[PDB]
């Protein structure tokens, strides 16, 4: 058996703007096997009200899935995504980039 390490991309569907409703995305792909945990953070704390896509895989048999939640962009709070996987000796955390 072989294993693959996930990539983590944290972004919004449109460029951030203060007070302007937005959706926080965390796209995780390229991992194997399917045994993966993906969570969205606010100020380091887990967000409970989060939805996700159904698990799929690509031509290279690698797995991918999307997590997302609705939020209001601000300047006070920070957002991020945390991903765990068996190929990761340490949990991966990626910060949300307002400008990407």
């Amino acid at each position: 058996m072989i294993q693959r390490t996930p990539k983590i991309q944290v972004y919004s569907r449109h460029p951030a703007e203060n007070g302007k409703s937005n959706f926080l995305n965390c796209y995780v792909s390229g991992f194997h096997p399917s045994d993966i945990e993906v969570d969205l953070l606010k100020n380091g704390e887990r967000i409970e009200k989060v939805e996700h896509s159904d698990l799929s895989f690509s031509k290279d048999w690698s797995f991918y899935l999307l997590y997302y939640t609705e939020f209001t962009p601000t300047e006070k709070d920070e957002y991020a995504c945390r991903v765990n996987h068996v190929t990761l000796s340490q949990p991966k955390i990626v910060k949300w980039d307002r400008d990407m």
Binding site: M1, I2, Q3, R4, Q9, Y11, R13, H14, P15, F23, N25, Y27, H32, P33, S34, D35, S53, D54, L55, S56, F57, W61, L66, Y68, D99, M100
Partner: protein, 274 residues
């Protein structure tokens, strides 16, 4: 132009914790339109696309049973393969199966697809002609021998050449305004200084459909393929997709740069400058 239909099926072992999980997701091009999950509350096939919500039990109930049969088979295969490779009973395994078809703009059958994999390794492939199996592993050779003897490819042909083609065709009509829709990228360019002399330009092409996109940078009219960074196309989470690219742009030299965004769904490319 042409259109693709795909279905992806995964079964993941779960020692102790009940039975192996079975997941199935269907796509038309970039759009998910059906789903199924063995851990679903409904334990039935569910639609996602408006334009397939008009289908009754005459499909869903049988398809649900079919996917159950698929799950049962995959679970058996996972156990069987463990035997073949003399693997520990305490180990975990994953099996992956996908199939589908391509059609032309006239609904004409182009290509069939069917491939299996096991624990990350290719298992068996079926050629686009749906006639000949290829084994990519020891256990695959065992299975291939069986499948060839019984002409398993014939079963795939009947579906992929027929049911898959007509199914997709009908969906393309019913969901025309949801599937063949176009959405141009919200193009813009930004400038991001790095140092006293160093800077970059970012060429944004976000919020487009379908996923099909090409980005090109030029300098002095010549393509830039070296000093560049691009991201893979990703879901926007709102039915569209995102993509951006950047190149190295020394301060004051930005006037020499231009980015282009090319689509097949658009009558013309878009050009970005700073």
């Amino acid at each position: 132009g042409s259109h693709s239909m795909r279905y992806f099926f995964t079964s993941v072992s779960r020692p102790g914790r009940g039975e192996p999980r079975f997941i199935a997701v269907g796509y038309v091009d970039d759009t998910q339109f059906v789903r199924f999950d063995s851990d679903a509350a409904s334990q039935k096939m569910e639609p996602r696309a408006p334009w397939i919500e008009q289908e009754g039990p005459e499909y869903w109930d049988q398809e649900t049973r079919n996917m159950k049969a698929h799950s049962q088979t995959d679970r058996a295969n996972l156990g069987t393969l463990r035997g073949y490779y003399n693997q520990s009973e305490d180990g975990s395994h994953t099996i992956q199966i996908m199939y589908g078809c391509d059609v032309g703009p006239d609904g004409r059958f182009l290509r069939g697809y069917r491939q299996d994999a096991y624990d990350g390794k290719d298992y068996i492939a079926l050629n686009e002609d749906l006639r000949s199996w290829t084994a990519a592993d020891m256990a695959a050779q065992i299975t291939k021998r069986k499948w060839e003897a019984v002409h398993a490819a014939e079963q795939r042909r009947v579906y992929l050449e027929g049911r898959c083609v007509d199914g997709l065709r009908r969906y393309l009509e019913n969901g025309k305004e949801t599937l063949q829709r176009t959405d141009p990228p919200k193009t813009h360019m930004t400038h991001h200084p790095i140092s006293d002399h160093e800077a970059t330009l970012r060429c944004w092409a976000l919020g487009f459909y379908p996923a099909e996109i090409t980005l090109t940078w030029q300098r002095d009219g010549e393509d830039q393929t070296q000093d560049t960074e691009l991201v893979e196309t990703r879901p926007a989470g709102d039915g569209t997709f995102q993509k951006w690219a950047a190149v190295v742009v020394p301060s004051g030299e930005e006037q020499r740069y231009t980015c282009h965004v090319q689509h097949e769904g658009l009558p013309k490319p878009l050009t970005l400058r700073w």
